[PDB]
Symmetry: C5
Subunit: 310 residues, 5 copies
Amino acid sequence: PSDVFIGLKIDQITGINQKEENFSVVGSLRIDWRQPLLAFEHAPGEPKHRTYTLATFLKLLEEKQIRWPAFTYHNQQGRMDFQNRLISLSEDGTVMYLERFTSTFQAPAFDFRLFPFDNQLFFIHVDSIFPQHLFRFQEMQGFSGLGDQLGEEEWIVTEVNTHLTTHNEFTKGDASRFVLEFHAERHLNYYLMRILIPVLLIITVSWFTFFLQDYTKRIDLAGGNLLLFIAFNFTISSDLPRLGYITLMDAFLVGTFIITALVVLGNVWLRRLENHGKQALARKLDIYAITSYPLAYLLGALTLWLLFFW
Amino acid sequence: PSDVFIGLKIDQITGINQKEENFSVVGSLRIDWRQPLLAFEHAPGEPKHRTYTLATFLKLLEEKQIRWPAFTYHNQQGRMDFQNRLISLSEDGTVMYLERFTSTFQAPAFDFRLFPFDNQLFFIHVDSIFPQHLFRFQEMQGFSGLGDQLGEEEWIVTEVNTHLTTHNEFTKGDASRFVLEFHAERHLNYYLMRILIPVLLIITVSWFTFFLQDYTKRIDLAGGNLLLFIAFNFTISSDLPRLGYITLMDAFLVGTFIITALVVLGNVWLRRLENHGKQALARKLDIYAITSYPLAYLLGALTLWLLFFW
Amino acid sequence: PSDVFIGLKIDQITGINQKEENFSVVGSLRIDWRQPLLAFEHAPGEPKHRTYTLATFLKLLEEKQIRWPAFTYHNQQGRMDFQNRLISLSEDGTVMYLERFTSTFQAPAFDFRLFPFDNQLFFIHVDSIFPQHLFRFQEMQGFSGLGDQLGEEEWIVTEVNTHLTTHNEFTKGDASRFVLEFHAERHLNYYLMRILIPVLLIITVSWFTFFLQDYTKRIDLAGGNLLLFIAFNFTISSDLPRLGYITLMDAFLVGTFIITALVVLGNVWLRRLENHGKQALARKLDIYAITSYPLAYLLGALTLWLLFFW
Amino acid sequence: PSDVFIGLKIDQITGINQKEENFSVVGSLRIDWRQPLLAFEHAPGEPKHRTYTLATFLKLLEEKQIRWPAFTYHNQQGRMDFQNRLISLSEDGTVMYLERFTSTFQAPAFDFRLFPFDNQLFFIHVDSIFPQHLFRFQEMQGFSGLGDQLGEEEWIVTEVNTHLTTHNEFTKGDASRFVLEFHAERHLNYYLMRILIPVLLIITVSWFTFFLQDYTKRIDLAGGNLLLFIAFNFTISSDLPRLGYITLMDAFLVGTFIITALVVLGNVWLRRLENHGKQALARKLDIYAITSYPLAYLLGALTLWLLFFW
Amino acid sequence: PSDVFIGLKIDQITGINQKEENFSVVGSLRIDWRQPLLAFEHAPGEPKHRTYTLATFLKLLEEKQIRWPAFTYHNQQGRMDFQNRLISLSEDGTVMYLERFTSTFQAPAFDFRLFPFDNQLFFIHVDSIFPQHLFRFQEMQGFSGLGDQLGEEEWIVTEVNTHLTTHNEFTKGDASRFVLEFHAERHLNYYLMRILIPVLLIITVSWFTFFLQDYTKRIDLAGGNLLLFIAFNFTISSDLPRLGYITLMDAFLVGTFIITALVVLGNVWLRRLENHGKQALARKLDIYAITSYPLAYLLGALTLWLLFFW
Ligand SMILES: CCCCCCCCCCCCCC
Ligand SMILES: CCCCCCCCCCCCCC
Ligand SMILES: CCCCCCCCCCCCCC
Ligand SMILES: CCCCCCCCCCCCCC
Ligand SMILES: CCCCCCCCCCCCCC
Ligand SMILES: CCCCCCCCCCCC
Ligand SMILES: CCCCCCCCCCCC
Ligand SMILES: CCCCCCCCCCCC
Ligand SMILES: CCCCCCCCCCCC
Ligand SMILES: CCCCCCCCCCCC
Ligand SMILES: CCCCCCCCCCCC
Ligand SMILES: CCCCCCCCCCCC
Ligand SMILES: CCCCCCCCCCCC
Ligand SMILES: CCCCCCCCCCCC
Ligand SMILES: CCCCCCCCCCCC
Ligand SMILES: CCCCCCCCCC
Ligand SMILES: CCCCCCCCCC
Ligand SMILES: CCCCCCCCCC
Ligand SMILES: CCCCCCCCCC
Ligand SMILES: CCCCCCCCCC
Ligand SMILES: CCCCCCCC
Ligand SMILES: CCCCCCCC
Ligand SMILES: CCCCCCCC
Ligand SMILES: CCCCCCCC
Ligand SMILES: CCCCCCCC
Ligand SMILES: CCCCCCCC
Ligand SMILES: CCCCCCCC
Ligand SMILES: CCCCCCCC
Ligand SMILES: CCCCCCCC
Ligand SMILES: CCCCCCCC
Ligand SMILES: CCCCCC
Ligand SMILES: CCCCCC
Ligand SMILES: CCCCCC
Ligand SMILES: CCCCCC
Ligand SMILES: CCCCCC
């Protein structure tokens, strides 16, 4: 068998789609191979290295009746665009190949249930067409990976890896597979500032209602604080992804709605007790409401942690 | 006639469009066929199996003057993209074919009137071009179907099937048709949490208004609860599909609007009776309102069930 | 001249664009023609009918130096995609042609001023390239039209027609034109439920304000009902098309805004009369307001009917 | 030099993009030219005029070694789609050419500062490749322009023109340029109904606050009218183009916000004077507020006219 | 080595994408080169300059076995569209080349943390394929740059530059690189009018609450001013870019929310002190609130300046 050295490098992640579950990149694929049948002596005044396009070089190989180690991108989505496809040929028969491209790729491992605390997995598979007794992939050391970013991005890359495996077609011979994989995360700082801090203030305004004496005014104030929560919710709607299943962020907001609505219902009942002449009993229930309100939020937090992270 | 064995497998459902009524996939089409005229003996040192691209192989067939069993995708929409198209040729004349693609498909059976409790039907048709006395489709057993999903999705597949039929063109000979079909559903859990629970609380706040004594304050509170319902409605608008016809979900929300508006009108009339000095009569009508309000919702639920599910 | 029989059938209307004024379809074009110069006798064991692709068949015609009746789609927009293009050739020289496609088409007749009560006209033109003394179109009977729909759609087709005309280029010979045209409408049921019923309730709440005694409370209630109308308006914005000209629906909503705003202004003036000590006069004007409010809506309806439907 | 007669006609304006500054059309390009070297005598039974596709005809010209007057579209954007490209050849050597297309075009002259009272300029440039001593453009009279529209549109065309100029490349010979240009406007009727009338009512409600006696109630009413203005503003947001610079419409709405906010601040100060026991002074300032409020709007209108239209 | 003179000019910036980090243009690439092997004498009556398309000219070079100085666009994104590709050939062997195109380009340097006061960097790289001892780039003086704009735009260009560098592939010979770069900014005038002025008025209304005597009314007014801020926030949402990280504009709006919410909480506590009979102490704390409110905004401004601009 003949050894083929291969590597892949990604310049830039050009987009990520959370609803369709795919991602897009710009990158470069490189292969080194040696074929002694291609060795030559340069003509008088000719340079020491010959250069062809892939279209030009494949004709040369067909005129010599030489087999090319062809390969394919197994999780590609749609059409792929090439910026350049270039070949250098050595005096000794060494072939150096390079192709540079733009493309989209399938991402079947995406899972957003722990949003915004989620970490996602990305990969690209390259497959040999011929079986492993003709051609065997070897890992080109030093080349493969991701380049550095230059401004400010949405996703932060945490880990990068490459390894070699096999695949099979037509129930015959196994063939080589090359894998590049990486992991990435969000800026949690941004969600603290945009969502948590203002919701905590809204929660505080609802608690402060128990500090006043007239139940009539309380009903007005509690009602208005529920409309304020709803108004805020649509103001953040563009930061929430459109998914047909439940997230941690969804559970948090619905639970806040439930507790704030219950404050309206309680103050109506305290007014009813006052109208029936049971002021002292209503005054006693008020004292229990003040202390149990923060305990309800603390026990809800604990519940969400158990259901989503264990 | 000559037997052609065929099968189709879908890796991933890459999108679903409810307004245009189409869907998109990535998959693989496989065909086995035997043609003794293609049998050969391998050259000294040559492998036991020959491999060509479809473009290369069709030239070989034309040089031998052999007919190829050509086929077409009958509900395809737009252009189809190919990732690979590959042929293996056996010593005995057996041809193995494989094509891997991305494409969109028409979906004329979609019907969303029972949303969110709806179940939808999907299919793909593959048609033979030549008539059934030249070539006959046979079902390749073990291959066809859907692969497993790996994270969390919007639609859950409930059933998968394949079968064989016929089609006709130019009022001449019948020709074979191959069908793959499947059924899928939503996560109802998500709609319970996002829509039902908060609407039930809003309905409860409107009922609690009948517990208070001053009709003047009631009018204020009932009015504000109607604006709260409208505000909530636009907060959920992104979860509702843009269709030009009536759904079960539409009927549910309009009915809730009607009943909450009627509470405003009733409390104005009770205030009018008080101003004309008919307090005792107004106090009697109030007692009938308290009990009939929940009965109206229960009888509305029953009505919706009859109109949509029977 | 030589007779060419032609017909067109549409499977599915794949989209309609109200702002750009175009529509999209999937369909099939069929032509029958006879050319005795193409008659043949089948070889020993050959089938009685020969089959070619369009690319293959045109070469045969060029080798025999035979003219093909070429045609073009005159209101096509953009690029057209072909799913299949197929030819059957009879022993007697009869040619049967079929092409199946996806495409978008221009729609210059669209006019939405009577929305939602509007009915729109659609058409497709097919033109012969050669003049009518070489080739003449004849209508293929039984084939042309629209197929049946299978679930639930936005637009309902009301009428379908085909006929033959002529066109002219280079101020020379007239040439044949084939026309398919159809008409379609909306589900008015949907707009009754989504728009009319809730607006009628909002109008009723504004009338009920005249039933109360304290002008001070009336000003509060009338003001809040105007904000409720504005809130509802944005909740329906996605059902309204984005057009740069006036519709019947636009006129209806602006008129409702005018009348509800005038109720706020009137109640402020009644409070001013009370402050200046003219209660009896203010009480008299109130009685005229109660009866004239419904008359204003009835006379507005009559006005809109005259301006838009006559 | 050889005279080339040229003309251009546009059927339909298929879209206009205000943020990207481009427009799209469907149209037809026509050229007449005479070349005696192409004269011929028709064969026995042949028609008097020969017809070719552009691909076919250019081969004929190359076999005779004849130069074709090639041209290019100088402000084209992206790819252009052709529906038909057709050639008629006369017995005397006269060539008649026709191409029919869909395409997008650059629009660098767009300027929206006077919105909605703006009038915009559109153009298309066609350039000769060869210099003017080989080939000279002449204007084909009677053909060029715009066709009639058939329903109801967003933009109304006010003026259409064509003329001839020159261009230069490689600092050598001047070459011909053909220009078609036109001007268009909006329906102002639509903006009167959708924006002006309701804003004028909101302005009137704010003035009516000065007619009441209790400053306490005034503060409530003035505050609520400011929230009503904000609510209305988002209801019209879809009619406003997304531009990164100031328009006349923007200035109008911000000025209305400023004046309505100032009414809230004034009524708080009048309440402060009442609390400090200076009722008579506060009552005097109220009389000045009533008359100066309409004068502020009149002087603002005058200011906007001077800044934008002079 | 052979000198190649190169230059690039951009007509129009056709779009800018802040979320994907790319931009689009229309422009023209020009190259001058001399090759004595191409010198010729013109035939009797032939013009003094020959003209070919790139496809035509490359054939001529292959028939003479002459090497072409090929090049590539190194940060191109997707497919590039050509409007024209043209060659002039001089009697003395001088080649003049021109290509005119539409395309999108990668923009990895974008960084929006200082929005709206940000200034962004753009560039385009052109790379030689052959190494620098065959061909060397030289800068074509007078040609390169940006053209003038004609109406009103979103971005204003502040600086333009070109320079020459090198690049390396296959660890062999260095090759030439040509760079064009430019810088651009926003209209700050627009953001002053749309965001700052109305927020400053909202801030002023919240301060004026401390001028009134009844804490009961203050709580109502402070609550309503918080809902007004939230309503305004969604009215401007379309002017804010959708980025997953914190901007200066984000920090400004969250800080305003915090301070306005704190006014609601303070007035509830002053009412509690009044109910417990500590009016004089509450009256004293009120005097400290009036002066410290503006100081909080001034010190917040200073803090934001330090964190973002130093
Ligand atoms: C960070 C902004 C969103 C906060 C969501 C928190 C809801 C879940 C509470 C339990 C968190 C468990 C620790 C990870
Ligand atoms: C599940 C969230 C939406 C609930 C809609 C229920 C409206 C229909 C009531 C009758 C249901 C009949 C049982 C399927
Ligand atoms: C059907 C929902 C919209 C109703 C619009 C009615 C406004 C026009 C009133 C006059 C109608 C004339 C009869 C067609
Ligand atoms: C027509 C609807 C928008 C009205 C905008 C008017 C603001 C400018 C006032 C001065 C107009 C000057 C006359 C053209
Ligand atoms: C210009 C409209 C937005 C204003 C944002 C100002 C917030 C930052 C305050 C400190 C500015 C420092 C001077 C550049
Ligand atoms: C979180 C809701 C607290 C409600 C406080 C009032 C409780 C009233 C209940 C009366 C029936 C026991
Ligand atoms: C949180 C809502 C509290 C509702 C309490 C209802 C208690 C019902 C008691 C009935 C006694 C007559
Ligand atoms: C669901 C609406 C209940 C209305 C309660 C008040 C009924 C008043 C009707 C007076 C006329 C009979
Ligand atoms: C739900 C609205 C109740 C309206 C009841 C109106 C009854 C009209 C009676 C007229 C008697 C003078
Ligand atoms: C539809 C508006 C009705 C207004 C009712 C009050 C009329 C007051 C007018 C006083 C001046 C004649
Ligand atoms: C619908 C608004 C009614 C306004 C009536 C104004 C009447 C002005 C009369 C002035 C008398 C001093
Ligand atoms: C348009 C704003 C009018 C304000 C009316 C009240 C003026 C009060 C000013 C007191 C200080 C001179
Ligand atoms: C439109 C707002 C009016 C504000 C008037 C303030 C006048 C300050 C005078 C201070 C005197 C103590
Ligand atoms: C910006 C918030 C100002 C709050 C004014 C009232 C302060 C009350 C604090 C009482 C506890 C010290
Ligand atoms: C800005 C909010 C002010 C809250 C002040 C709380 C002070 C707590 C003192 C407790 C004394 C019993
Ligand atoms: C339905 C799950 C209840 C979650 C309560 C939310 C509490 C979160 C505390 C931070
Ligand atoms: C117009 C149909 C009335 C439907 C009433 C809604 C009641 C739903 C109860 C769950
Ligand atoms: C400006 C046209 C006035 C239209 C009034 C609307 C009344 C509609 C009654 C159904
Ligand atoms: C900042 C420019 C002030 C414009 C005032 C608006 C008045 C318009 C009167 C119709
Ligand atoms: C969290 C950063 C606090 C910023 C306060 C905003 C003050 C801006 C003054 C113009
Ligand atoms: C801003 C937080 C104040 C907490 C007050 C607690 C009173 C018991
Ligand atoms: C939260 C549900 C309370 C139900 C109260 C019923 C009173 C009759
Ligand atoms: C009277 C107020 C008591 C506050 C207790 C708070 C316990 C969390
Ligand atoms: C729900 C319609 C009630 C109509 C009341 C009419 C009173 C004059
Ligand atoms: C006085 C309250 C009676 C509650 C009856 C509720 C019947 C559903
Ligand atoms: C509807 C316009 C009324 C104008 C009233 C003017 C009072 C001075
Ligand atoms: C006192 C109420 C009279 C109601 C008259 C209604 C006429 C439409
Ligand atoms: C419109 C600004 C008024 C400032 C008033 C200041 C009072 C101390
Ligand atoms: C007492 C009201 C006077 C109204 C004057 C209006 C001047 C425009
Ligand atoms: C009694 C009002 C005092 C105002 C002081 C303002 C200091 C910024
Ligand atoms: C990832 C865990 C999700 C569980 C939801 C209850
Ligand atoms: C699917 C049943 C719909 C019936 C609507 C009344
Ligand atoms: C279709 C008639 C429209 C007339 C508008 C006044
Ligand atoms: C077109 C004139 C604009 C001037 C803006 C002040
Ligand atoms: C550009 C400086 C950003 C720092 C954010 C704290």
